[PDB]
Design a binder for this molecule. Structure first.
Ligand SMILES: Nc1ncnc2c1ncn2[C@@H]1O[C@H](COP(=O)(O)OP(=O)(O)O)[C@@H](O)[C@H]1O
Ligand SMILES: Nc1ncnc2c1ncn2[C@@H]1O[C@H](COP(=O)(O)OP(=O)(O)O)[C@@H](O)[C@H]1O
Ligand SMILES: Nc1ncnc2c1ncn2[C@@H]1O[C@H](COP(=O)(O)OP(=O)(O)O)[C@@H](O)[C@H]1O
Ligand SMILES: Nc1ncnc2c1ncn2[C@@H]1O[C@H](COP(=O)(O)OP(=O)(O)O)[C@@H](O)[C@H]1O
Lengths: 443, 442, 135, 442, 445
């Protein structure tokens, strides 16, 4: 019916109006202090005043670090942008890692714009061009004007088209009897389909039949758009959307990432500030999430030191599970969580704690509830004891083979024999390591 | 095709209770691993859960890639099975995470349902109006059956399909509307007066009777990575074959995810997950493992199967040693299947199956000698000796491999151990680690 | 690229045809059910088998922008140079086509031959009708 | 007449249904290796297996490359054979995995047979006739085209389609031209004017092809030999297009790209379909990789992956190292520089060094190939020098002896010439002696 | 001209007799008799051309004459035979692999020879008349061309007419058309019309009107290497890659086709094969992969004769972790023959310095020559060779036309050799930046 994958039993942080976390609500069990700190961070993000704040989630493996970031993303809502990253994604072969980090920084700042469009639309009834005096004169096009007759509901208009508009008109392969849509902001033309006023069953090109557009031919409408700053940066960097030669050739070449200079970013910031001052724009800062932060090296950390001190950069959430580890790209420095101390000085560390037997048991119970399985109480106790003995994730991932083995025996509940058979068929890390130690030829 | 190493395996050899038969479907022995692989296969065919990592481990020549091939044969068609090696991630054109993302998204299939209309009839009249340069093309087509007669309008693609495999006003054709396919079935009129240039030797068929137009429902499977490459740029269908899909941006991927969810909501499309098999997973950097640790937690993730044969070896990209060459973060969120070595009876059954596959007839004494030398040396050496002894068998003109043919094949070709013995005996003739050799024999 | 024509070359030269160029020129006008043409038409068969011409668009760009305008205050030469570079008649005529009645007027009522026409129709076709626009 | 370290070897020199003799085909000695390579040649000619690997190992100057070239000579000129070095797989345009897969696909051959109906000869007349009832608003409504052809000992007038007049006007076919009309496609093409129309103008760029022999209409059954990589590289690049992208890509540098698995799968299935039809057939070949010890462990792992394919050819490797560290690793000591995973998948052929009389026979063969006359005492001194220093040193010193004999105006090589050549040109051991005894940066 | 006095420009071929016996001093070469005899043997091997793929190794101490020997072989080889001279550092490219760069360097050193006939009609166009038929299917042309002596009338085909519409002629441009080939070119405008149009234009050029016979006959011979044929058949317009180096890893099948067609043209009789010498100076910085590729590539029929020069002792092979003689692996040294070179004495040093002073147009006294000989005995030879040319400038600044002992002593005092600089560094090493980056800047402690 539905697809579940290691998550989606979590719907939020699960707090009341005072910020006090319940013991079990919202799909979360335990970790009260971390959830309250994440609620404070959520309120700070919703305040929309700060810039360049950062927190770090530190804890052991399998303790709920990525779960808290996904709970923050669910508590914020879909309107606030959220860019999840892994630390290995910043190394690209097309552009340096500094530009990729700045791109992901600019990808987490949203914007909402009320946009006004001048629209000519209707049904094409007359398509008549007229010619130039000397078509082989070398300079100037072949034709001079194109007369287009458009008919909408309760209206009819005639237009004398520029040839440059007619290139986009004839690139869409319009004809007499087609409903078109001309956008005067960019010159883009959309061919909607054949009109339904004529016959239907005499076509061979699986076309779509559309009634006449309501209202007049010439229109003005207001459109609310959601746009990030990185979208404006890559739109101005590779210009596609005009009707000129360069904008036409921009759509045909193979795209490649380029080092966008800071001058373009200053110009985009100036235009966005003008749009905000005009009262048609609203700025929505977001969250950038970098999981497995220990994969970064010293150069990206040193650039991140500068990039957090700008006046645009969003809230950055990191995560790591290292105790005292040398930073990558260095030889002999040793720093907590693989994060250098100059970056550590600008953070706010949120500690995460391991679980107990009862918390493991109720987590197993809720994840068996989500996966639509029925578990007996003795099998649940055995699964909780296994989770304490080996791993929480190993007891989590043994539920579905137990369900398959129960279903092959024509049963609905999960009993102790299925758990024992899944133990015997499937191994964990410790038993595999113990087998590898007592092995013959590097098993 | 030809005869490959795993060409004798058709399925996993399991009953309805997921209990492995000892000798069935080309797989012998290894009952625990076969039962576990059947459990994984039923988990894949369920299609409910996502992002499970399965690890197959053991000594070399044990049946790991044989188990993966058996799973892929039992999976059947229309479910994607992406099988890659560990060294294919490293490229000069894409990053490691981008190649891993493409390999992940190649294993998710989308089944799209389409409504089409089939037109089969006899061509009566063709009118084609083209401009002077031949660019703008339009016209009308008059087709008939034994009951009806309809005039259709033609576009550019229809005229291009007509002017290829040229129809000559009396051929019986079939047109699919949604696919744009024109198929010339044959000629029914058999006109006498014909130009002496083309062949026009088509077969004689009858004019079709009944309804000219028929509605039909068709389905087809398209991978997610195909949709990303198609919507990436203008000529993405060429990039599906040339492989020039350079670092597709994330906005394309999340818009494709939203559109796929919309199509599932509308009832148009359904999502079919698959299996991604990574053989020799130990040849991956720690950055690839760190990316896999987060890519396994997405909803659009397939069942990842990894196979390795290393013991406690050094993880690539670091300076410490780990079991199976994998860090403990990946080993925590993975489930391990352990394969075990064989007896002499399983070796004999394997050799008999491989001899039956290669159409090689063996005597009982030759099979016993091959079983003994596969017990002493590796199994793969005694598997490889069979065709060599077969060619020696027709070199003395008898179609039955005897003991002397196996003895001659053992004499001419060497093991791993015998070559090591000869090198350690005659070290002065080979170039060693320091580049020292003695070529002169005086 | 635009002005290039397939002119003739003399036989006594060191530039001969490769096997790939012969493979290219065999299947230029070959019909269906021939082994060479079907062996060199993998992409068209994959296009027809996958029902790709009735697929929909799933991606649209967020922002579309024209190129950045450069202005020099008080000079008419820069405006003419910019209008010539942005709207070059040769390239814009190469990326489009002449209407049919215009072609009839110049070929018949003006005496212009076909070979003296400007080069037209070099814009690559999209995959579908839906893939031709972003609206 | 050019000779370069080889071309005295003409096949393995085996008798049928038996073993090698001593001196045959330019080979002296090495009987067991020649018998093993003959068995391998018979296995390749059996045309059934896929991905069998053979590694032949021994000291330097033993005849491994001579054995591989003898295998390629014994197979014939129609079976594909791609020689390679291990250093060639490291390119800067594409990854090494793609280069290995390209060289894998280069070694599989295909043989396609066709039939062509051809009209050709000198054009005698070209009358586009006009219809009985023309339509208004048009000019010269053509009903048919009558064209007369003239060739050697035969002429024939035709009656063609009206559409072919457009292609006739497109390709500028006039009177006195030689044309080339195939049957089904139409598609008139022009080769040039006749030789009889050459002496009416002093200056003309156009060549004059002679009048062709044979009748106007004939059927020729042609056979085309292509490889699978040729089909992949023909399908991957687009054809002659009418867009800016294909014209721009033809005039730019042909950069190599990463060919996807989907294109190879489609090529394989259309090749299998036409093989089943009875037209084409498959000729697998040999991929030879000399100096296999220069590969690193990633290419070895991908070779382990690719040797289990259904379409892989036979692979022949050669190495001279002993217990040597594998490249790309720091602590893997392995025989011949090959990892044990690859070693377990192959068979090892052993090659042995020679003795004095075989050295003398090989020197005599290389002397009589190079058309040189050697005295008997000079031959004995050259054999003693070769067995004292190197076989290749004695082989490479034959041409300076011939030059020194030609200088003194005689056609025989005597002891004084080989003494002068020993004095003039040094070897590795004496050079090492004079470097170890001098400290002037020598 | 565009050549200055280089390091060794005095060497014009090996100084050998007709019996391959070196003279003691001839053709700018002094001493080194055994190496000169070996180079003469190799030169006769190249000139015979029936032996393919031989590697020789010129090994010796520095400043001995290995590159001088290669320059002498190149000068004695003559023209129209390809001699490629590359260094070991040139094959480490960014757009080409080392294997591909070595293959291109191998194929640049073997060529084919093609001879063709030309019937040139070069002259100034007087007037052109075009006759068009009523049908228009053919165009007839009457061309009135002239030289400074006489003028004829020629009839033209339609292909001439279409070829003269392109690169159009305006009755007074100088053209030249072939008869058999029909090649058309436009050289430029005549000098007689240079005062007509009052402004030249963009593409135009003024050439003199050709004089004498209008119709000439000339036989020319071309020498094309195989690499040029590979680059030409690799692309659509390949000569831009021939002049800009943007070839980019040409495939193997075009090379096999070109080899087959070269063998076919040799068998027919259209062209003959001219082999050549490839010289790899400073071979000791090549990787082990390049050495293995050289070992495999030396055994092909289309291989040149490879000359390698190195001056390393028992040094480390690059790309490995061990040492080897000459910095080369032993399997490469197996398929090679070594020509060794010996150091000079006082008399050969004096003769070399006298020849170099003769080449550089510098007059020396006997005492100055003996002082420079003593300096070249104690220090190296190139130090004295540079001392000659700076002492000439010192003597010219002293308003003297000859170089004396005082000028040589002043040039010795002004410019240092290696040993005095080593002593001065080792005496005051606190003022220099050492390997740890420590330096003392201030003069007062
Ligand atoms: N408080 C919790 N309640 C329920 N499930 C949890 C809790 N904490 C962790 N988990 C589960 O444990 C698993 C590992 O947590 P995650 O944060 O993804 O990895 P890690 O803790 O190693 O960073 C997740 O699948 C999550 O569902
Ligand atoms: N049960 C089996 N059935 C069929 N073939 C087998 C079986 N066990 C082993 N083999 C053969 O042994 C080899 C196993 O090696 P491989 O497939 O690489 O996996 P692994 O490396 O895990 O042993 C294969 O060639 C396979 O043909
Ligand atoms: N059995 C043989 N008969 C004749 N010539 C031989 C024989 N074995 C080797 N040679 C000669 O030795 C030379 C080099 O041998 P090669 O194949 O390079 O050995 P390796 O590849 O082991 O270095 C070749 O030119 C070949 O002619
Ligand atoms: N035999 C010789 N005759 C004339 N000049 C020589 C001779 N040998 C060396 N030289 C001169 O010595 C100079 C340096 O010698 P060079 O060839 O560079 O030494 P190496 O071969 O060690 O690099 C050159 O300018 C050359 O002119």
């Amino acid at each position: 019916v539905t697809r579940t994958a290691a998550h989606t039993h979590i719907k939020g942080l699960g707090l009341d109006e005072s910020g006090v976390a319940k013991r079990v609500e919202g799909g979360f069990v335990g970790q009260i202090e971390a959830r309250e700190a994440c609620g404070v961070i959520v309120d700070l993000i919703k305040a929309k005043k700060m810039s360049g704040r950062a927190i770090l989630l530190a804890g052991g493996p399998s303790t709920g670090k990525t779960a808290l970031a996904l709970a923050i993303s669910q508590e914020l809502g879909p309107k606030v942008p959220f860019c999840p990253l892994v630390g290995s994604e910043l190394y690209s072969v097309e552009v340096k890692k500094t530009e990729t980090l700045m791109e992901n920084f600019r990808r987490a700042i949203g914007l909402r714009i009320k946009e006004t469009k001048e629209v000519y639309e209707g049904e094409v009834t007359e398509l008549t061009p007229e010619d130039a005096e000397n078509p082989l004169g070398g300079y100037g096009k072949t034709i001079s004007h194109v007369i287009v007759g458009l008919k909408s509901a309760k209206g009819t208009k005639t237009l004398r088209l520029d040839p440059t508009i007619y290139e986009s008109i004839q690139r869409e392969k319009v004809s007499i009897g087609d409903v078109i849509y001309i956008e005067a902001n960019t010159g883009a033309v959309k061919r909607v389909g054949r009109s339904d006023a004529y016959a239907t069953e005499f076509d061979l090109e699986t076309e779509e039949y559309v009634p006449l557009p309501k209202g007049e031919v010439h229109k003005k409408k207001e459109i609310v758009q959601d746009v990030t700053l990185h979208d404006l940066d890559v739109a101005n960097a590779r210009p596609q959307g005009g009707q000129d030669v360069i904008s036409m050739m921009g759509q045909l070449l193979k795209p490649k990432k380029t080092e966008i200079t800071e001058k373009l970013r200053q110009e985009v910031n100036k235009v966005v500030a003008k749009y905000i001052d005009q009262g048609v724009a609203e700025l929505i800062p977001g969250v950038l999430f970098i999981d497995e932060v220990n994969m970064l090296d010293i150069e990206i950390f040193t650039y991140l030191n500068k990039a957090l001190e700008s006046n645009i950069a969003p809230v950055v959430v990191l995560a790591s599970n290292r105790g005292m580890t040398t930073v990558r790209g260095t030889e002999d420095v040793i720093s907590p969580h693989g994060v250098p101390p100059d970056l550590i000085d600008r953070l706010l560390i949120v500690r995460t704690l391991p679980y107990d037997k009862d918390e493991i048991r109720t987590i197993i119970e809720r994840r068996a509830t989500v996966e639509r399985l029925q578990v007996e109480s003795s099998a649940l106790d055995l699964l909780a004891t296994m989770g304490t003995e080996t791993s929480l994730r190993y007891a989590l991932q043994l539920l579905a083979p137990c369900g398959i083995l129960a279903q092959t025996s024509n049963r609905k509940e999960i009993v102790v024999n299925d758990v024992n058979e899944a133990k015997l068929l499937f191994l964990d890390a410790k038993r595999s390591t113990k087998i590898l130690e007592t092995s013959a030829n590097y098993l | 095709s030809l005869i490959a190493a795993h060409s004798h395996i058709t399925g996993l050899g399991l009953d309805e209770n997921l209990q492995p038969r000892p000798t069935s479907e080309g797989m012998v022995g290894q009952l625990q691993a076969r039962r576990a692989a059947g459990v994984i296969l039923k988990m894949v065919q369920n299609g409910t859960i996502a992002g499970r990592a399965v690890l197959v481990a053991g000594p070399p020549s044990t049946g790991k890639t044989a188990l993966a091939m058996g799973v892929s044969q039992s999976l059947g068609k229309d479910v994607p099975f992406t099988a890659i090696a560990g060294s294919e991630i490293f490229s000069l054109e894409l990053s490691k995470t981008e190649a891993l993302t493409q390999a992940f998204r190649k294993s998710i299939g989308i089944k799209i349902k389409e409504e089409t209309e089939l037109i089969e009839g006899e061509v009566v009249e063709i009118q084609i109006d083209r401009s002077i340069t031949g660019g703008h093309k339009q016209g009308k087509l008059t087709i008939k059956t034994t009951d009806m007669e309809t005039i259709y309008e033609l576009g550019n693609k229809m005229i291009d399909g007509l002017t290829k495999e040229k129809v000559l006003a009396g051929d019986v054709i079939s047109i699919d509307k949604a696919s744009g396919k024109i198929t010339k079935l044959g000629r029914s009129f058999a006109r006498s007066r014909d130009y002496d240039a083309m062949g026009a030797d088509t077969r004689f068929v009858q004019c079709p009777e009944g309804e000219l137009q028929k509605r039909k429902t068709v389905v087809h499977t398209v991978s997610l990575h195909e949709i990303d490459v198609i919507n990436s740029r203008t000529q993405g269908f060429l990039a599906l074959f040339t492989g020039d899909t350079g670092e597709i941006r994330s906005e394309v991927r999340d818009q494709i995810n939203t559109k796929v969810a919309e199509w599932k909501e509308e009832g148009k499309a359904e999502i079919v997950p698959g299996v991604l098999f990574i053989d020799e997973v130990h040849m991956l950097d720690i950055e690839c493992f760190s990316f896999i640790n987060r890519a396994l937690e997405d909803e659009f993730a397939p069942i990842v199967m990894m196979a390795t044969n290393r013991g406690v070896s050094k993880t690539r990209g670091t300076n410490y040693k780990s079991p199976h060459g994998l860090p403990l973060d990946l080993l925590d969120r993975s489930i391990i299947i352990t394969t075990k070595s064989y007896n002499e009876q399983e070796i004999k059954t394997i050799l008999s199956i491989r001899a039956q596959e290669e159409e090689v007839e063996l005597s009982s004494d030759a099979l016993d000698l091959l079983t003994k030398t596969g017990v002493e040396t590796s199994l793969r050496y005694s598997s490889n000796l069979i065709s060599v002894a077969q060619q020696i068998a027709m070199k003395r003109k008898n179609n039955t491999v005897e003991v002397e043919d196996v003895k001659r094949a053992y004499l001419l070709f060497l093991d791993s151990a015998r070559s090591v013995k000869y090198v350690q005996e005659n070290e002065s003739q080979y170039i060693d680690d320091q580049g020292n050799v003695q070529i002169s024999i005086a | 690229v635009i002005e290039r024509t397939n002119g003739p070359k003399n036989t006594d030269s060191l530039s001969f045809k490769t096997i790939t160029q012969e493979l290219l020129e065999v299947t230029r006008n070959a019909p269906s059910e021939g082994v060479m043409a079907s062996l060199l038409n993998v992409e068209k068969h994959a296009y027809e088998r996958e029902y790709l011409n009735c697929i929909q668009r799933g991606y649209h760009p967020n922002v579309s922008a024209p190129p950045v305008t450069i202005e020099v205050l008080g000079s008419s030469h820069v405006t003419n140079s910019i209008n010539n570079e942005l709207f070059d008649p040769l390239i814009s005529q190469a990326l489009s086509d002449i209407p049919a009645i215009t072609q009839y007027n110049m070929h018949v009522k003006k005496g212009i031959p076909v070979e003296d026409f400007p080069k037209t129709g070099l814009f690559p076709e999209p995959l579908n009708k839906n893939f031709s626009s972003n609206i």
